[PDB]
Design a protein around this ligand. Structure first.
Ligand SMILES: CCCCCCCCCCCCCCCCCC(=O)OC[C@H](CO[C@@H]1O[C@H](CO[C@H]2O[C@H](CO)[C@H](O)[C@H](O)[C@H]2O)[C@H](O)[C@H](O)[C@H]1O)OC(=O)CCCCCCCCCCCCCCCCC
Ligand SMILES: CCCCCCCCCCCCCCCCCC(=O)OC[C@H](CO[C@@H]1O[C@H](CO[C@H]2O[C@H](CO)[C@H](O)[C@H](O)[C@H]2O)[C@H](O)[C@H](O)[C@H]1O)OC(=O)CCCCCCCCCCCCCCCCC
Ligand SMILES: CCCCCCCCCCCCCCCCCC(=O)OC[C@H](CO[C@@H]1O[C@H](CO)[C@H](O)[C@H](O)[C@H]1O)OC(=O)CCCCCCCCCCCCCCCCC
Ligand SMILES: CCCCCCCCCCCCCCCCCC(=O)OC[C@H](CO[C@@H]1O[C@H](CO)[C@H](O)[C@H](O)[C@H]1O)OC(=O)CCCCCCCCCCCCCCCCC
Ligand SMILES: CCCCCCCCCCCCCCCCCC(=O)OC[C@H](CO[C@@H]1O[C@H](CO)[C@H](O)[C@H](O)[C@H]1O)OC(=O)CCCCCCCCCCCCCCCCC
Ligand SMILES: CCCCCCCCCCCCCCCC(=O)OC[C@H](CO[C@@H]1O[C@H](CS(=O)(=O)O)[C@@H](O)[C@H](O)[C@H]1O)OC(=O)CCCCCCCCCCCCCCC
Ligand SMILES: CCCCCCCCCCCCCCCC(=O)OC[C@H](CO[C@@H]1O[C@H](CS(=O)(=O)O)[C@@H](O)[C@H](O)[C@H]1O)OC(=O)CCCCCCCCCCCCCCC
Ligand SMILES: CC(C)CCC[C@@H](C)[C@H]1CC[C@H]2[C@@H]3CC=C4C[C@@H](OC(=O)CCC(=O)O)CC[C@]4(C)[C@H]3CC[C@]12C
Lengths: 189, 390, 85, 169, 75
């Protein structure tokens, strides 16, 4: 311990400012697109409880921005031109057509990813058999849901596969992936 | 000490048998080396610029002479001329390194501390060493001198018990660690084992060994070697190719490491100097006074090395400057006479260090050759296997 | 913070019936999944269909122990309830 | 290797940066390859570039052994800068010992050193390089137009050369 | 020498007027383009066989009516 005065039984890890705004409220963790305007869960709540929609909009757009999304750097004064083209130099009708196309594409991609996740579930349920050598044939639903929401780093997947292959033990899961912080260099980016 | 009360005859026959001149008697327990700092005249601590500039200029002149010659006859000279210029350059640099070791312990020019820090850094860089880490390892050595299992920054001996453990784990005497120890402490390459020391500095390049308040100071210390090996070792190669590297840098480097290793190894190792564990009779003053050996060289060598062999005086008076080390020794030899050990650098000494004193066994508390020891403990392996019958 | 558990239950049962292929009267609030014909690889696809219909994300640790329709309904309701905060 | 008692030891907060052994490995590779090449051919740029980058990357991988400090972040920044410069020299100027007789045979292209440096840069960016975020270009008079502080707005206007404009606010 | 420098940003070498003559004589210049607002500057691209490989050199031309025959004679 370094602590001269006070030291709880778990060491204090210095948490820092968040560097990115949270996912909105309307989004899901997966690849399938959101909902154009209103989410679906809004229909199963009290009218005097659905104020969190507009509050979340206010928070992401105006009042809770982490001072790291307001750094003036040389990369951002060029991204400004890209974005200003998209928002002021392109007519909203072409933007609307592109929006529809991109939605359709994302639905196809999400369908593909779901197919792949189910395939992975069979594969690892098969690998646990080699691992235990004997009976074990199940898989972990926790890991399936964590794979669908992109909550695993590749190293965690590899170590889980190895643990399965060697000792069965289908219920021992890697911890969880932490979100990536915004990269900053200097006046540069 | 190992040879306790016994007449002068056996002492002197042991002395001329091992190559020492005066063996040592026995010091009382319960003391400290810093005591005998009161036996020193106060004039020994005075600063004078004459000896300072002489000590920084003589080895520089030897180095410059060696380099001027070597470049005047770059690669047209036979191997013996190359060897001699390399030996001269290595010795000159060992002198400048003794000066840097003095600046690391803050006793060369105390009035200008920034200047002495910069000077020590500069003189230590060409050997690829760090000044703050050197200070730390040397202090840790002074605090634990001859302590078994703790003096890791000195010539810790290879004990019998750990060797037996490694032989039980290896399942025979043919493993990799086995042959490694076999060639490192049975061949003359032992006189260069200091290079191992060099690699154990850079404590993994790991800032997690130190106190946080010092990070910036430690990092800076590591950046002076690297900068050298990043800005100067290229130039040399680029300007002389492999040969122009092996003759201008690598041979003086090997000579300097010879000097370092032989000095330390002779300093704190001898058959009559025991290595007590902690709690089991380890005494500080007894180990710093009785457990030290003073090497005597020709006076030209001494003046070239900046009296680098005189180590006992600056362990009882850590502020005693470098040019007062010979004189001070003469004082202590009068009062601590019967207890000191002394030796002269001769071929017999190094042959004994290489061929005879290889393994340290604590039951007999002495050094014994590697081969007879391993075959003895292997015969006892056979006998415990016979004892393992049932 | 206050969820109409009745609506959530009706919608859960309708989704389950449409996924499995059995009719809505057979899906009872206490019916386990193993008897409705569900085999592991499909107690997962049912979870995915549920999330896709309700647009929420399931808490995985509790989702490992879903075996009756009422637990599905209660998981979904506890997720919808904790949405603002 | 494998540890049956806890298999997921690599994903455990040991106190350093994840990309710390890769940095030292790459430094060793650069130094060895540079020296070997410059001895095997006779060109003096390979060893100089290789050993310069090796020194800088060893220093950065030393500083990266405690990621909470301020030096722990300047280490990551230094390593990213060096790997980016390597990628740049490779894909835009090429190496001296790789000239040919033709003109399109000697064009600067991306090979294996540039590829490793690019992978390293991506690894630094996707693990953690978010420190010292308060170093940027100074605020404009455009950022403080709507700020609730008169003293601060006056200070910024003064610095940018508008100290005499009237603050009808 | 070429062996003791860093490769840096391919540019146009410069011949005076004379090594151009010797080079086009020895059959090493491969193609020539004229430019300059008064049409007295040459950009000459050599061929691989030359000492130094294909490079792009610049020459200043002071009126010489023997130039065209010399060039067209050597391919
Ligand atoms: C093929 C079908 C094109 C039919 C047409 O009339 O195509 C012409 C279109 C331009 O169409 C104009 O498109 C306008 C789009 O307006 C819509 O979009 C506008 C913002 O874009 C406003 O919001 C406006 O209110 C909203 O109605 C209206 O439809 C105009 O009546 C119509 O003339 O050009 C284009 O196809 C786009 C040009 C791309 C050329 C490359
Ligand atoms: C020890 C390995 C030496 C080696 O390989 O080292 C060669 C390079 C690193 O060497 C660097 O090589 C550079 C030149 O590389 C180029 O030239 C090389 C041969 O000269 C290869 O062609 C390499 O692909 C290509 O990038 C410069 O010479 C640098 O000074 C020198 O340090 O490693 C590599 O190829 C990178 C290794 C692949 C990453 C795994
Ligand atoms: C110059 C004068 C300068 C003035 C300063 C004098 C101060 C004296 C202090 C110096 C202390 C030096 C200690 C030397 C020492 O530790 O080394 C002696 C140490 C031995 O020491 C023991 O070594 C053991 C080995 O692991 C353990 O590490 C023990 O902890 C360690 O104490 O040397 C070694 O580490 C030997 C193993 C390394 C193998 C050698 C590699 C040989 C490579 C060949 C080189 C090319 C040859 C051609
Ligand atoms: C594939 C190789 C294993 C993955 C690896 O790089 O491990 C990367 C791990 C990451 O290392 C740990 O990462 C954790 C992630 O949160 C924590 O941040 C720890 O601080 C960090 O030490 O480091 C290793 O142990 C590397 C060991 C092998 C080094 C490779 C040499 C080449
Ligand atoms: C390929 C580009 C690498 C980027 C992949 C990132 C994957 C990742 O996040 O892994 C997951 C972990 C990172 O781990 C993250 O660490 C964070 C703390 O910083 C937190 O712990 C997060 O939870 C954890 O996701 O990656 C590793 O441990 C390091 C992987 C190093 C891979 C780099 C390969 C490039 C090396 C090539 C150089 C060759 C030189 C020899
Ligand atoms: C000359 C250029 C020199 C720079 C070299 C490039 C360095 C490498 C790329 C930098 C890391 C990217 C940072 C990041 O992704 O920010 C988020 C950015 C938006 O920038 C962000 O945009 C935000 C506003 S908004 O999102 O656009 O509304 C704003 O908060 C933020 O400050 C701004 O950075 O999102 C992008 O999609 C960037 C993708 C472009 C990458 C191509 C790089 C070209 C090489
Ligand atoms: C001119 C300048 C030139 C500069 C020269 C620089 C050269 C030095 C670098 C040379 C290359 C160094 C690579 C060392 C890798 C290593 O030893 O990792 C040390 C790790 C421990 O990691 C560690 O594990 C520790 C936890 S534990 O106690 O070990 O479990 C933890 O403290 C630590 O964070 C974690 O990293 O050892 C392992 O646990 C086993 C190795 C697992 C991976 C094997 C890959 C090794 C190469 C395979 C071929
Ligand atoms: C290449 C020549 C011309 C210039 C000199 C280079 C040195 C500055 C390099 C080469 C050897 C390196 C050392 C080789 C071995 C190690 C151990 C290594 O750390 C470990 O192995 C940690 C323990 C473990 O891995 O189990 C990194 C630091 C260190 C001292 C290195 C530090 C930097 C050194 C001294």
């Amino acid at each position: 311990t370094s602590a001269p005065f006070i030291s709880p039984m778990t060491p204090y890890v210095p948490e820092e400012e968040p560097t990115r705004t949270p996912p909105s409220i309307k989004d899901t963790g997966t690849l399938r697109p959101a909902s154009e305007w209103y989410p679906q869960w809004m229909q199963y709540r009290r009218r005097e409880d659905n104020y969190v929609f507009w509050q979340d909009k206010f928070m992401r757009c105006s009042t809770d921005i982490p001072w790291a999304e307001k750094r003036w750097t040389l990369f951002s004064t060029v991204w400004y031109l890209v974005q200003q083209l998209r928002f002021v130099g392109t007519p909203p009708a072409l933007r609307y057509v592109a929006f529809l196309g991109w939605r359709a594409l994302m639905f196809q991609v999400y369908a593909a990813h779901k197919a792949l996740v189910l395939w992975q579930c069979k594969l690892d349920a098969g690998l646990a058999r080699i691992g235990s050598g004997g009976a074990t044939a199940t898989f972990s639903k926790t890991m399936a849901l964590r794979r669908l929401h992109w909550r695993n780093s590749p190293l965690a997947e590899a170590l889980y596969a190895l643990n399965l292959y060697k000792t069965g033990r289908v219920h021992l899961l890697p911890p969880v992936a932490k979100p990536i912080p915004r990269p900053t260099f200097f006046w540069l980016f | 000490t190992s040879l306790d009360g016994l007449p002068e005859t056996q002492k002197y026959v042991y002395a001329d048998e091992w190559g020492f001149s005066r063996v040592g008697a026995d010091f009382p327990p319960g003391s400290h080396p810093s005591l005998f700092s009161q036996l020193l005249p106060q004039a020994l601590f005075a600063f004078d610029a004459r000896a300072a500039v002489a000590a920084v200029a003589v080895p520089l002149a030897a180095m410059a002479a060696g380099y001027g010659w070597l470049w005047y006859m770059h690669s047209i000279a036979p191997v013996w001329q190359q060897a001699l210029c390399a030996a001269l350059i290595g010795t000159g640099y060992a002198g400048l390194f003794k000066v840097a070791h003095e600046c690391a312990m803050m006793r060369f020019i105390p009035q200008m501390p920034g200047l002495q820090a910069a000077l020590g850094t500069l003189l230590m860089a060409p050997a690829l060493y760090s000044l703050p880490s050197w200070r730390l390892h040397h202090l840790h050595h002074l605090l634990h001198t001859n302590m078994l299992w703790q003096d890791v920054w000195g010539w810790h001996p290879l004990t019998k018990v750990e060797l037996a453990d490694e032989m039980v784990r290896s399942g025979g005497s043919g493993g990799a660690a086995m042959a490694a120890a076999r060639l490192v402490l049975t061949t003359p390459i032992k006189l260069f084992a200091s290079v191992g020391h060099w690699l154990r500095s850079w404590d993994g390049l790991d800032l997690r060994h130190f106190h946080p308040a010092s990070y910036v100071e430690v990092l800076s210390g590591w950046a002076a070697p690297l900068a050298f090996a990043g800005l100067v070792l290229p130039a040399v190669v680029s300007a002389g190719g492999l040969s122009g590297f092996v003759s201008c840098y690598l041979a003086p480097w090997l000579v300097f490491h010879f000097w370092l290793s032989v000095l330390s190894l002779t300093a704190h190792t001898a058959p009559h100097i025991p290595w007590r564990a902690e709690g089991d009779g380890w005494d500080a003053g007894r180990a710093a006074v009785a457990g030290t050996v003073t090497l005597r060289l020709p006076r030209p060598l001494e003046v070239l090395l900046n009296n680098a062999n005189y180590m006992l005086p600056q362990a009882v008076a850590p502020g005693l400057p470098m040019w007062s080390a010979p004189a001070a020794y003469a004082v202590l030899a009068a009062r601590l006479g019967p207890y000191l050990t002394e030796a002269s650098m001769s071929l017999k000494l190094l042959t004994n260090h290489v061929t005879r004193w290889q393994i340290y066994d604590e039951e007999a508390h002495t050094y014994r050759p590697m081969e007879e020891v391993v075959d003895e403990i292997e015969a006892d392996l056979q006998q415990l296997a016979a004892a393992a019958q049932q | 913070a206050a969820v109409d558990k009745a609506k959530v239950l009706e919608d859960v049962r309708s989704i389950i019936s449409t996924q499995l292929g059995t009719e809505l009267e057979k899906v009872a609030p206490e019916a386990k999944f193993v008897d409705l014909g569900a085999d592991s690889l499909d107690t997962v696809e049912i979870m995915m269909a549920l999330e896709e219909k309700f647009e929420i994300a399931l808490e995985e640790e509790g989702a490992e122990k879903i075996a009756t329709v009422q637990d599905a309904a209660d998981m979904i309701a506890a997720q919808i309830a904790a949405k603002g905060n | 290797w494998w540890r049956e008692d806890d298999p997921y030891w690599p994903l455990r907060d040991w106190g350093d940066h994840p990309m710390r052994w890769w940095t030292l490995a790459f430094a060793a590779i650069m130094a060895a390859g540079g020296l070997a090449t410059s001895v095997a051919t006779g060109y003096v740029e390979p060893v100089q570039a290789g050993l310069g980058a090796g020194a800088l990357l060893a220093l950065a991988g030393a500083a990266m052994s405690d990621a909470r400090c301020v030096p722990g972040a300047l280490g990551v920044k230094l390593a990213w800068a060096v790997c980016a410069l390597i990628v740049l020299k490779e894909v835009s100027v090429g190496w001296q010992h790789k000239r040919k007789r033709r003109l399109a045979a000697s064009a600067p292209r991306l090979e294996l050193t540039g590829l490793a440096a690019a992978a390293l840069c991506a690894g630094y960016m996707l693990t953690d390089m978010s420190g010292m975020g308060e170093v940027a270009l100074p605020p404009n008079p455009g950022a403080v137009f709507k700020s609730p502080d008169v003293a601060y707005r006056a200070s910024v206007w003064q610095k940018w050369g508008y100290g005499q404009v009237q603050m009808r606010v | 020498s070429v062996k003791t420098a860093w490769r840096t940003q391919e540019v146009l070498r410069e011949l005076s007027y004379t090594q151009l003559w010797a080079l086009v004589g020895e059959g090493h210049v491969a193609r020539v383009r004229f430019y300059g607002p008064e049409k007295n500057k040459v950009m000459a691209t050599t061929r691989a066989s030359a000492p130094g490989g294909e490079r792009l050199c610049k020459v200043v031309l002071p009126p010489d009516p023997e130039l065209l025959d010399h060039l067209v004679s050597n391919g």
